[PDB]
UniProtKB/Swiss-Prot annotation:
Cystine residue pairs: none
Ranges where the record places region Binds lipopolysaccharide: 159-182
Compartmental location: Nucleus; Cytoplasm, Cytosol; Mitochondrion
Complete-protein stretch covered: 363 to 595 of 598
Name recorded for this polypeptide: Nuclear receptor subfamily 4immunitygroup A member 1
Family according to the record: Belongs to the nuclear hormone receptor family. NR4 subfamily.
Length: 230
């Protein structure tokens, strides 16, 4: 069934805890006075960039996504990148111990991250504290993130198909949270996340803006383009 392909895709993409690079991790209690140096913005951009290749590779693995047009595969992917990023990050990190795990498998401390993420990172952890208290299980999360991707976008070549695939995933989610219990919310508790997630992209754009002005290192073209869909 589909829910399985969704689960495999989620699972077969994120860094399995036990391939997570700790070689740059620093346990800090030391908030850092300093204007972010060029090393930080370079780190910042490499994580975004990294996260995008993972996200992309995970999309093909979503049944039906790949038989959509290349342009819509790019439209959906490009419009969804930043939220997917936040959401995948939030679910896999452990806030109770201020640890951010990135899709590339890099572990990194909250205060390590304030450097190039700014106060953004706090709202991401707050939101991540939000997610965990909801105890969203894996299958549901694998539907939830698919829905953030497969969703209506202005200038879609073929909105009707996307809606069909959106529908399959959505009812597929409903089946599952049905099984857990006795359509009825619950769902909309979980689904209430999706707009909270939209605020978070905002601050990320703000942060990318502030960095496109301080203008140390150039952004990766891939990410500048996404930023430019503004």
């Amino acid at each position: 069934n589909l829910l399985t392909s969704l689960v495999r895709a989620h699972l077969d993409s994120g860094p399995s805890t036990a391939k997570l690079d700790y070689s740059k991790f620093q346990e800090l209690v030391l908030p850092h006075f300093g204007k972010e140096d060029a090393g930080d913005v370079q780190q910042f951009y490499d994580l975004l960039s990294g996260s995008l290749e993972v996200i992309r590779k995970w999309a093909e693995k979503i049944p039906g996504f790949a038989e959509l047009s290349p342009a819509d595969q790019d439209l959906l992917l490009e419009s969804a990148f930043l939220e997917l990023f936040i959401l995948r990050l939030a679910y896999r990190s452990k806030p109770g111990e201020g640890k951010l795990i990135f899709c590339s498998g890099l572990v990194l401390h909250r205060l390590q991250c304030a450097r190039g993420f700014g106060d953004w990172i706090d709202s991401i952890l707050a939101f991540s504290r939000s997610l965990h208290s909801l105890l969203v299980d894996v299958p549901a999360f694998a539907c939830l993130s698919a829905l953030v991707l497969i969703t209506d976008r202005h200038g879609l070549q073929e909105p009707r198909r996307v809606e069909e695939l959106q529908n399959r995933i959505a009812s597929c989610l409903k089946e599952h949270v049905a099984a857990v219990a006795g359509p009825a919310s619950c769902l909309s508790r979980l689904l209430g996340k999706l707009p909270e997630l939209r605020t978070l992209c905002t601050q990320g754009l703000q942060r990318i803006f502030y960095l496109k002005l301080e203008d140390l290192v150039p952004p990766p073209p891939i990410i500048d383009k996404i930023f430019m869909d503004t």
